[PDB]
Every structure is written in C-alpha cells, then in structure tokens.
Chain length 81, copies 4
C-alpha cells in the first residue's frame, strides 16, 4: 500500500492545483471587471461641464441686468416726453 | 491500512466543498459586478448636459438680438 | 501519525474555507454599497426637468421678441 | 512511515501558498473596490445641478419682470 499512499498523494496534489487555478482565474477576472467598473465611473463624473454650464447661466443673468438698465432708460425718456 | 482510503474519501469531500464555495463566490461577485458597471453607465449624462449648454447658448444669442432691437428702438 | 496529520490537514482546510467565506462575504457587502452609491449618481430626471425650464425660458424670450 | 510525514509536510507548504494567494487576491480586490466607491461618490452632482436649476428659475423670474416693465412703455407710448 506504499504505492496507494503515493496515488492518494498525487490525486491530492492535482486537486489542490486545480483549486489554485480556479482561485487565480477568479481573482483576475473580478479585478479586470473592477478596473472596467472604476473607468465607467470616471465617465459619469460631469463636474467640470456642470460648473461651466452654471457660469454661462450667470453671464445670462448679468445680460438681463443690462437689458433692464436699457429698458428703464427708454422708460425714463418716454416718461420725460 | 485502508483507514487511509476512508481518510482520502473525507479529504475529497471537504476539498470538493471548497471548490464549490470558490466557484459560487466568484460567480455571485461577478454577476453583481456586471450590475455595477451597467448602473454606472446610466449615470453618464454627457449628451444631456451638452444639449443643455447648447440651449443656453442659443438663449444667450437671443438675448443679444433683443439688445440690438432695444437700441434700435432707442435710435427711433 | 496518519490520523494526527489528518486532523492537522482538516484544521488547515477548515481554516481555508473560513477565509474564503469571509473574503466573499466582505467583498459583496462593499459591492452592494458600491452599486447603491452608483445608483445615486443617476440624475436623468433632474437634468431633463432643468432643460424643460430652459425651454420655457426660450419660449418667453420669443414672446418678448414678438411684443417688441 | 517517513514518506507519510513529507507528504503531510508538503500539504502544509502548498496549503500555505493557497492561503497566501487567497489573502492577496481578496486584499487587492477590496482595495480596488474602495477606489470604485470613492470614484462613484465623485459622480454625484445633485447639489450643483440643484443650484443650477434655481439660477435658471431666477432667470425666468427676471424675464417676467422685464415683461412687466416692457408693458409699462406700451401704456406710456399709447398716450399719443
């Protein structure tokens, strides 16, 4: 049964080896998908675009202030009629 | 003696349970990872934000038109 | 010595399964928190409602233009 | 007898390699997962979006003021 012990040893090694293979197959599979996850996340970061968008809306507002000034100037003139 | 065979049978069972848990865990985590990337894709609104700005720009151009119109009425 | 060694291997293999379950259980907990956090970054409704307001703004501009 | 001990000794060595690979992978994936959640937090722009909308609403409110002012000139131009 000395050979028996050897076959049982080789079978144990093979299985353990396959286990290590499944563990390595997974960890890199999940890590890769995780790298694609973080990347897709970066895409959803529209911080700069929004801040720019607000500053243009602000220029807009400052242009309506201007329009009002001109508006009330016409008002004065037609009032001094 | 053959107490080794029964011992080997037990070792096979436990190791098989291990492999099952490994495959189950990785299979579950991966399915939730595909759900994560897909949900993130939804959070991308680059097109929407851009159309919004282009609308603000058109609106600004319309402001300039009124401004010219106003001064025009002034000259009158 | 075969059984005592078998008892030793069983302990280590049992510890192995525990670490596997711990790792998988922890990572999933952080992914459910991750997916939930990702869901928060969806602003489709807000972005669109904002645009509809700008459309009213333009509509009012066109109204002013005709008034003049 | 001895050949059994070395066989057992190998199992200890190999299983230790197994535990190490397990710990390395889990530690690595989690660290990259915490990087994921933090990056996701960056993508939340609710506050900015909200202030953005409130400014456009003020913009509309000011337009209504202009409409009222513009009519005033029409009432006075209507004098004639």
């Amino acid at each position: 049964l000395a050979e028996n012990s050897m076959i049982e040893a080789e079978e144990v090694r093979g299985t353990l080896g396959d286990i290590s293979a499944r563990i390595e197959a997974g960890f890199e599979s999940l890590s890769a998908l995780q790298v694609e996850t973080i990347q897709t996340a970066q895409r959803c970061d529209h911080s700069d675009s929004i801040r720019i968008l607000g500053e243009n809306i602000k220029i807009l507002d400052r242009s309506m202030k201007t329009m009002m000034e001109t508006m009330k100037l016409m008002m004065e003139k037609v009032d001094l009629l």
